[PDB]
Amino acid sequence: PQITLWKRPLVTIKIGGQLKEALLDTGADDTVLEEMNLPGRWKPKMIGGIGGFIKVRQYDQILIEICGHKAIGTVLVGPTPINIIGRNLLTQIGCTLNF
């Protein structure tokens, strides 16, 4: 499909058997999701943007479905104000910018 940018590009995703709303974000290197209790091991990480850095938990090879498009890759989990789908997964669903 095609998504215009008049409003925030929020879409439904499926992760760990849960449906959430997330932002398709070309400015995010990696996917970061609001606090959630995923199982498995993880690695500490810090990611930075406007305002500074937050601490997150890095989970690897996590399956996520974005608009019915399946993907698998790194998912960060932490106190982000919003669920963010980053380039690491946007590439996997064939997402491009067009103008």
Added chain:
Amino acid sequence: PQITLWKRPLVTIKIGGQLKEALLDTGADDTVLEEMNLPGRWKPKMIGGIGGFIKVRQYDQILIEICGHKAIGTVLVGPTPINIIGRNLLTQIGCTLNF
């Protein structure tokens, strides 16, 4: 053009008669540029990102050309980690997400 997301979607912009590199950022409502000298009046504003809130200078009705496409809109100037082009200007150049 069609821009894939394996690398950061960095493009050259022209603002205040000066060339700069900036990130096309569909997750940003607004356009935020690193510290620079812009002519005309400005108002102090606050904006929040993943790590909290920063103080910025708001310039309205600024001419800015993004990858050969002209836009006239609001540009925030402050301590952002990188020049980001947000939806307020992405809409003006006709940018959409496609997958």
